[PDB]
Curated annotation (Swiss-Prot), chains A, B, C:
Modification note: Oxidation of Met-40 and Met-43 by MICALs (MICAL1, MICAL2 or MICAL3) to form methionine sulfoxide promotes actin filament depolymerization. MICAL1 and MICAL2 produce the (R)-S-oxide form. The (R)-S-oxide form is reverted by MSRB1 and MSRB2, which promotes actin repolymerization.
Function recorded in the entry: Actins are highly conserved proteins that are involved in various types of cell motility and are ubiquitously expressed in all eukaryotic cells.
Enzyme class: hydrolase
Main localization of the protein described in the UniProt heading: cytoplasm
Name of the protein in question: Actin, alpha skeletal muscle
Family membership noted in the UniProt record: Belongs to the actin family.
InterPro entries the UniProt entry points to: Actin, Actin/actin-like_CS, Actin_CS, ATPase_NBD
Catalysed reactions, as listed in the record: ATP + H2O = ADP + phosphate + H(+)
Organism: Gallus gallus
Source species taxonomy: Eukaryota, Metazoa, Chordata, Craniata, Vertebrata
Keyword Cytoplasm: yes
Keyword Lipid metabolism recorded: no
GO biological process: one example: skeletal muscle fiber development
Leftover remarks: In vertebrates 3 main groups of actin isoforms, alpha, beta and gamma have been identified. The alpha actins are found in muscle tissues and are a major constituent of the contractile apparatus. The beta and gamma actins coexist in most cell types as components of the cytoskeleton and as mediators of internal cell motility.
Modification type N6-methyllysine: residues: K80
Length: 371, 371, 371
């Protein structure tokens, strides 16, 4: 029987069948509930919406995100999201298909414990497994040696690997991701006058961010140019016909990745965090990691991010090293593609957690049979 | 058992049976009482007249309107109007049928409280309901989205809806309707020497307004054209053969709707009222409201009103948006037609106030079980 | 020479000389123009009126506010109000006096750029300064730490400060203030048959809101009390001598501050705004901020507000922390009082923007020198 690969991200769900080369369904991880009153008898139905139907009717709803900062926080909505996925997106009964789930490293253990408990008790899957996202990202790239950098919607973590042996003491995780940039951009758009506060208009600001934002290769030069010239300005149209114009906000918004002090956080930028993660590895394997930086996740889709990372790491590492940034165009779905590859492998079939194993050992097993 | 439908206008009473295609009885809401010395013996009986028999005899009667600005001001007359309807026009037994009334938004609570009290205690109606006018108008159009401009004889309210969920913070209401236009017409006609002062001549002026008055597409152009040429002058005959002729008055009377200052008011015309109602709704749904701009009520039957409203709203709103004014030819009875459709619904049967429920809770129950 | 402190509020202008303990001039921030026929010859002069003399004649005027939500929208009238202030209320030529201003946080930049331009070029002040209102409100209390809650007529905004250092990522701003409450009062007074559709009647409703309104310590209990008895009702005499009577509208209106879902806003009440602004801070300073809460602004004069906010934050925050609401008796002017404090300090004299620096740099200097 064909297994199911389900990557519940903080921003998007990527679910489908093992063996494909792309997710079958991709819909935002939100659940909406009406806030106005219904008056037209026989209409105004379905007090909750999930995914794209909720997105379309967002004009009258408060949109709730179940997964925050990569730690699940609202289990009812998440069971609802899983049910919608299986029964309306994939349209396949979950109880007949082995399942593969993903989680970020350094995550609360109760997270995966209850994640296993739900999948076994409610959906009755024959077996299941949980795999660190960065391992899957490295599988998608066919490499056995790389320092994965995955930057999703709420989290951003590095995982240094060498010939298949991970280095769990060299793992860094950073709570700075796309939603933080969305909020900061919503905060700096009021600096021109365009005020967005709602849960709906946060989606407009996110769409603006996707549409226009880019990373400056030398921040001060772009700041000076924008302050002294108008070739960088750009205009975007809201759903009600208004047209907003944004100037240097385009490259100020993504810059939080490299200077988290824009939002007040203390941590060092992504570049310095990756270099530090490399420096924690044995002397004999810093060379290989310096040349196998594998990116992933949505937030790493900004133009100029790859060149900026290459520059900002080569500035730190010794001159004689060869920094190489690898960023395939498909990196928005790299974790899921790796998950598909991993679930397909014949030698992997001996590693699932089965229903009877769960019956004997309960959720606690998921830590022993999954790193 | 079939339920009556009674739409109590400020100027006309529309009554009928639920499910039918049009009202059964339509007559003005006036009560006349003779103002002259009776001389003949066994003649001129029946002290007070109502409706059509009041209009016919209006030579010797003092015509009074029980309602004013959509507020029932004389219950001792409105009870007579209801009795006339039930026991002379429809000729039904009120105890055998539910009754679905109507009332504009923002009316005083005591209005519907006392309305329900009268319906339940005087007529013994087994069940009843008081549905806002704009929702009925929107049923009558077979839609679930739109912004209704229902301009009756007392009130011109403006209710926006979206997918069955009304937006009560954006319901504008402007007290300027057909009666005020009749008053302004009656005043301006003194310019030419025709002095109408008695309450029957107010009916004559209402007839002139209905027959002739029309809304200019460009007010200043029509003013200049009428001033410089007599092409627009038209003649009307009083019931005594006196031939009056009114020129620019024909559009100076309706024009007040768009320039309320003509009668001393400040508030902006109906175009601005509708636009401001739109601009207070969520940003997502504005595009859909711009294209479902229903109208209703008697006063909107003026020729050239729809074109003028299209012109003005298109002028105000952003260009990229598409405005659409919708005006069905039977919009003089849209509220009643929607009431019929509503009363004919399947699920609507649970939402009647029942005589038992009113007896247990009291007139406050209309604020709970009705919009 | 003595410097002027000129706090241009959304609903009042507070002005005077720095150092004094109270404003020299306090008059409403409105401009009025006639709207009737000026029949008499040699009378009906002064085409427009400002402030108190504009209220005096409001019966024949249309009143307009230059500022809408702490944003200047009508420059040709704000300049007019400033001229009125300088040359009629303080009666001093400004070209010899430095000026201190105020603004809300997270506000459009063009606002202050243009304000600096007007002040320098039209009035010729030697120097001027613009300071966020919460900083000044914290000077008013002599506090170097705390979380200011400034709720003016236009806007509400929290600003946390710790031992002199601001946390501009944790600043929050909410556009819900006295005027929204006044309009909601105008709306809910219709239920009782009173109608206030005029701007002059908006001034009357503002006076009613000032007088009869308070905050409910437990909203449901107050609803039960009002429904179950007529204890709360109070009467107010209109200028015409008509007397109105209002029941639970006394606290339904100031309740919107804690439930913006009354007026269609989905946002969180001021208590949740404050709690979230605190939790955005670092862990070591939350304990200090919980016990250093400060209010300001006119809108916080509703009786019982401090106790209700005490209750709400104590409901949200951990039980071991101490919640304490500092509500100075003079909080209506806290901002102006803080300005009087600030402008006197010698150490501050080096922060003025002089005419010379403006000439060298242009209006953009106000973003680099001012907070
Ligand atoms: N082309 C893009 N440019 C910038 N940001 C993007 C782009 N596409 C997506 N994003 C951002 O990335 C986030 C989603 O990325 P994603 O990989 O799906 O995270 P996750 O799966 O964990 O939820 C979104 O919040 C979005 O703002
Ligand atoms: N053809 C018309 N042109 C202009 N006004 C009209 C026309 N027919 C009716 N009216 C006006 O519409 C008003 C009655 O319409 P109606 O919608 O039924 O008011 P109500 O809300 O009380 O029911 C009257 O004031 C009448 O003058
Ligand atoms: N004693 C009061 N009780 C209730 N509301 C008040 C009181 N004094 C003023 N207000 C309201 O607060 C607003 C004025 O407060 P204010 O602080 O001066 O605003 P601004 O920022 O413009 O200076 C007015 O809208 C008024 O309705
Ligand atoms: Mg991811
Ligand atoms: Mg009507
Ligand atoms: Mg103020």
């Amino acid at each position: 029987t064909t297994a199911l690969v389900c990557d519940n991200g903080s921003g998007l769900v990527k679910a489908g069948f093992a063996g494909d080369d792309a997710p079958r369904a991709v819909f935002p991880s939100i659940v909406g509930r009406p806030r106005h009153q219904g008056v037209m008898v026989g209409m105004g139905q379905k007090d909750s919406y999930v995914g794209d139907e909720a997105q379309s009717k967002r004009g009258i709803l408060t949109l709730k995100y179940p997964i925050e900062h990569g730690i699940i926080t609202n289990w009812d909505d998440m069971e609802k999201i899983w049910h919608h996925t299986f029964y309306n997106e994939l349209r396949v009964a979950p109880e007949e298909h082995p399942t593969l789930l993903t989680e970020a490293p350094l995550n609360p253990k109760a997270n995966r414990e209850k994640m296993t408990q739900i999948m076994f008790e409610t959906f009755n899957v024959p077996a299941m497994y949980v795999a660190i996202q960065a391992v899957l990202s490295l599988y998608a790239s066919g490499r056995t040696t790389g320092i994965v950098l995955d930057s999703g919607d709420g989290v951003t973590h590095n995982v240094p690997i060498y010939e298949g042996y991970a280095l769990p003491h060299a793992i860094m995780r950073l709570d700075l991701a796309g939603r933080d940039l969305t909020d900061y951009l919503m905060k700096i758009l009021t600096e021109r006058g365009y005020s967005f506060v709602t849960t709906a208009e946060r989606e407009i600001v996110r769409d603006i961010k996707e549409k226009l934002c880019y990373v400056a290769l030398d921040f001060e030069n772009e700041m000076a140019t924008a302050a002294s010239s108008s070739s960088l300005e750009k205009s975007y149209e809201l759903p009600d016909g208004q047209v907003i114009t944004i100037g240097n906000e385009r490259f100020r918004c993504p810059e939080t990745l490299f200077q988290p002090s824009f939002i007040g956080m203390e941590s060092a930028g992504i570049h310095e965090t990756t270099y530090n993660s490399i420096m924690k590895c044995d002397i004999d394997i810093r060379k290989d990691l310096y040349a196998n930086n594998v990116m992933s996740g949505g937030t790493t889709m900004y133009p100029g991010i790859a060149d900026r990372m290459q520059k900002e790491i080569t500035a730190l590492a010794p001159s004689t090293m060869k920094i190489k940034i690898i960023a395939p165009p498909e990196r928005k779905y790299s974790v899921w593609i790796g998950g598909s590859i991993l679930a397909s492998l014949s030698t992997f079939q001996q590693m699932w957690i089965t229903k009877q194993e769960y019956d004997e050992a309960g959720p606690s097993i998921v830590h022993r049979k999954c790193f």
